[PDB]
Design a protein around this ligand. Structure first.
Ligand SMILES: O=C(Nc1cccnc1)N(CCN1CCOCC1)c1cccc(Cl)c1
Ligand SMILES: O=C(Nc1cccnc1)N(CCN1CCOCC1)c1cccc(Cl)c1
Lengths: 304, 304
C-alpha cells in the first residue's frame, strides 16, 4: 500500500554519465559503447546562443577540443559528428558499464525518470512526463544540460530525453537521443513560448484507479457518462480528449478494481465540476497526471 | 528552475541489494562488507507473526537455512546473529560493490530516499520523510521488507531506514540499521495505531523559500509575526512548533532570498488561515513538508 511518484533505479544510467567540455562550456554527456552523446550547444558561449550557426561553429572544433572525462579519467576523442541537435563524440574506449539500451522517441503523456547531473556527476533522480505541449516540468540548473530521461524494462534502458533548454517560463525543452527536439523548440536564446499545458486525462484516470486500489475511495459516485459527454467536460477544463485507445489501455485497471472506465470518467467529471472540497487523493489536493496506466500497474504489482 | 521531489541517485545502494530466503519467506537484504542485514521476521511465517518469540524461532535456524542470493549467485552464510529487530548474516565474501557507508538514526522531519525492492531486485526510488509520529508514507507491497532508506554525502551512503511493516492504515514502520524501530512499533501482527501525523513546519517554510527562488511568489504578504504568535496558529493546524533552532537552520535560505524567517512564517500563517483559494505553489495545492532546508539548498544549488 501507499502510492508514490517513483523513479526508476538510476544505477544503470549513472554508469553512463560523463563530463563534456568545449572551450569554456561544460555540460553532461551520455557514454554508450564508444560514443558520447551531448547537446550540440556545448560548442557555444552564452553570446553565441543568440543566433548560432552550429555547422559554422563546429568547423572551428577538432577532436582534441572536446574534453570528455568519466569520473576522474580522460577519454580520448577520435571522431565527432553532429546529428540534429546533438553531438556524437567517438571515443577510443567502449563504456564498460554500457547497459542494454535503446533510443526511443516518446509521445506526449508518457512518463520517464530524469537523472539530473552537473559536471558529469549525478545530483538526483525524479519522475517527469512529456507534457502535451512538448515541454517537461523538471528541475534543472545551468550545467544540467545533457542530463537524460529514460525508462527501464528489466535490464534494458530506453533513453528518451536529453536536456537542452529552459524556457523563460521555467519549463524545460530537450531532444530525443537522435537530437530531434520534442515540440517546436530550437536550441537558440530566442522567444519561445510554450503552448497550452493540458492535463493528461488517461493518466489522471489511471491515478484514480491507483487511489481506489490503495483505499482512497471518497470520490467514487453513483454516476456514469459516455466518451462524448465526458469529452465535453474535458474540453472545458483543458483536459486531453479521451479516446477508445485510452479506455482500452485502462482495461487491466478496470478489471482489477471492478470499476468500469466510464464510471471512473463520471467520478473525474464530478471532481472537475465540483473540485476536491478541501479533501485529498493519495496525499494530493489536485488531480495528478504524471502516472501512466502502465506506471500504476507496475507500482501496484511490484515489477522489478 | 523548477523544483521536484528528488531522490538521491540509487546506484550505490542497488549494488548492495540481495535476496534473503528462510524457509518459505523471502525478503530483501542489504549486503555491506561481509554482512547481510535483513528484518528478523524473515524467520517467520504469516502465522508466526501473531505473537513471535524471535529468540525461540531463531534456535531452530542454522547458517545453511538462510539463502542469500546476490543477482543470480549464491552467497555462503558463515554466521548469523540477531541485533534488535534485524538479522546480521555473515557471508564468506565482502560485497565488492560496498560503497563508503554509515548507519544513522534519523530524527522526525528528516528526509531520505527509498530504494523499493522485491526478491533482491530494485523496482523504484522515491523520496520520504520520517513523520513526527515515526511512520513513513511509502509505497511498499508484500516482499518489499528489507528495502532501505538512505541519504548520500558525495561518496558516503548514510543508511537510516530498513522497511519492516505496514500498519492497517497504509502507513509504514521500520527500523534503523541497528534494528531499532522508529517510534513505538513492534514487529508483530498486532493493533498498532499511529499517533497524530503533524506537519513538519520547518520543511514547509523551506519549501516556501524554494517557491520564492523559483518564481512562485503570490503568497508573500505585507505581514510579519513572532515565534510565539506563529506557534499559536501552528498548534491549531497540527503543525510542529517552530523553534529558534529551526529559524537558525533557515538562515541561509533567508539570506539568499532577503525574506526574513518571521516574515515567511507570517505568509505561512495566512496560508493556514485562508487556504490556497484554488491556487498552487510549485505545482502543489497543499503545503509540502517533505523537503528539509538542506534539501532545498542542495537542489537549488546543484550539489552532486
Ligand atoms: O537553457 C539553458 N541552460 C539551462 C539553464 C537552466 C536549466 N536548464 C537549462 N541554456 C544555456 C546554455 N548555455 C550555452 C553556452 O554556455 C552557457 C550555457 C540554453 C539557452 C538557450 C538555448 C539553449 Cl539550447 C540552451
Ligand atoms: O507488514 C508486512 N509486510 C508488508 C506488506 C506491505 C507493505 N509493507 C510490508 N508484514 C508481513 C511479513 N510477513 C512475514 C511472514 O511471511 C509473510 C510476510 C508484517 C506483518 C506484521 C509485522 C511485521 Cl514486522 C511485518
Amino acid at each position: 500500500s501507499g502510492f508514490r511518484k517513483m523513479a526508476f533505479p538510476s544505477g544503470k544510467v549513472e554508469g553512463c554519465m560523463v563530463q563534456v567540455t568545449c572551450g569554456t562550456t561544460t555540460l553532461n554527456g551520455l557514454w554508450l559503447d564508444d560514443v558520447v552523446y551531448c547537446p550540440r550547444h556545448v560548442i557555444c558561449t552564452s553570446e553565441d546562443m543568440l543566433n548560432p550557426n552550429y555547422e559554422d561553429l563546429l568547423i572551428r572544433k577538432s577532436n582534441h577540443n572536446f574534453l570528455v572525462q568519466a569520473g576522474n579519467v580522460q577519454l580520448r576523442v577520435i571522431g565527432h559528428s553532429m546529428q540534429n541537435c546533438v553531438l556524437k563524440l567517438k571515443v577510443d574506449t567502449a563504456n564498460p558499464k554500457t547497459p542494454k539500451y535503446k533510443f526511443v522517441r516518446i509521445q506526449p503523456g508518457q512518463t520517464f525518470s530524469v537523472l539530473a547531473c552537473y559536471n558529469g556527476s549525478p545530483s538526483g533522480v525524479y519522475q517527469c512526463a512529456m507534457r502535451p505541449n512538448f515541454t517537461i516540468k523538471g528541475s534543472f540548473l545551468n550545467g544540467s544540460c545533457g542530463s537524460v530521461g529514460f525508462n527501464i524494462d528489466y535490464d534494458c534502458v530506453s533513453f528518451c530525453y536529453m536536456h537542452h533548454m529552459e524556457l523563460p517560463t521555467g519549463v524545460h525543452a530537450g531532444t530525443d537521443l537522435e537530437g530531434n527536439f520534442y515540440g517546436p523548440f530550437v536550441d537558440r536564446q530566442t522567444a519561445q513560448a510554450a503552448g497550452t499545458d493540458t492535463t493528461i486525462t488517461v493518466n489522471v484516470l489511471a491515478w484514480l484507479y491507483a487511489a481506489v486500489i490503495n483505499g482512497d475511495r471518497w470520490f467514487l459516485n453513483r454516476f456514469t457518462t459516455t466518451l462524448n459527454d465526458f469529452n465535453l467536460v474535458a474540453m472545458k477544463y483543458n483536459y486531453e480528449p479521451l479516446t477508445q485507445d485510452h479506455v482500452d489501455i485502462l482495461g487491466p485497471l478496470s478489471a482489477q478494481t471492478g470499476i468500469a472506465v466510464l464510471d471512473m470518467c463520471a467520478s473525474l467529471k464530478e471532481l472537475l465540476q465540483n473540485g476536491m472540497n478541501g479533501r485529498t487523493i493519495l496525499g494530493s489536493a489536485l488531480l495528478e497526471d504524471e502516472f501512466t496506466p502502465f506506471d500504476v500497474v507496475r507500482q501496484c504489482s511490484g515489477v522489478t
